[PDB]
Design a binder for this molecule. Sequence first.
Ligand code: KHY
Length: 221
Amino acid sequence: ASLTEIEHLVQSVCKSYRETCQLRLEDLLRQRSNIFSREEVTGYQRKSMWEMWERCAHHLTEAIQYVVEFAKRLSGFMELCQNDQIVLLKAGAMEVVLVRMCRAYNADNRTVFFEGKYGGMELFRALGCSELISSIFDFSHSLSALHFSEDEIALYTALVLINAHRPGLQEKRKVEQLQYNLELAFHHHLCKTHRQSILAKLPPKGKLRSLCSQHVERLQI
Ligand SMILES: COc1nc2ccc([C@](O)(c3ccnc(C(F)(F)F)c3)c3cnc(C)n3C)cc2c(Cl)c1CN1CCC(C(F)(F)F)CC1
């Protein structure tokens, strides 16, 4: 694994994310002024849990679609066997989406972009998952404090997908080979941008899975 190869890997990863990030970001930052009025927030709270769960379920499904496209555009990922690709996506797709969401989170007023405007966590009262949604707002808040950059998100969510310790793989050493090169590109790029400091400030990652596995009680696919 040469150096210019690692620099290519970085650019190759940052372009894949730019093409599959779902929302441009400058759109997100621009609309931070577009906030839900107390009346609009009530319209969301009066919805039933089934109405809200369906809306959200449709957002995740669409989000996960962009993550698969992101994975599908990663060099090396397509070279894996089909079993590994499904194993990795089936385990990491959701975690990547949780990390991607921090971009829609505005730490100024503790609101997230949701269907055209920004709202606080009281917007999802109908789901009945007060604690779960609180935890997500904390996570997104932690990542926003770092001023996570587009390329940092692209390299990091790549390291969330390409995890050689996922159970079910059968060409493990290939995922390890790929996982290390994405760590090299991540570290290398952080050096070029004087951003080695965000490493210690990153949430572990067992918590990233903890929000899913520990707090998820899936009843719809
Ligand atoms: C705070 O809670 C949420 N906040 C969201 C923020 C943005 C988007 C959104 O889909 C989105 C916006 C920007 N970027 C992303 C991406 F990058 F993440 F893909 C997604 C979106 C919104 N409005 C539009 C037009 N869009 C596209 C969906 C969101 C959802 Cl569903 C939820 C509720 N969830 C959370 C996790 C779930 C769990 F089970 F895991 F707990 C269950 C319940």
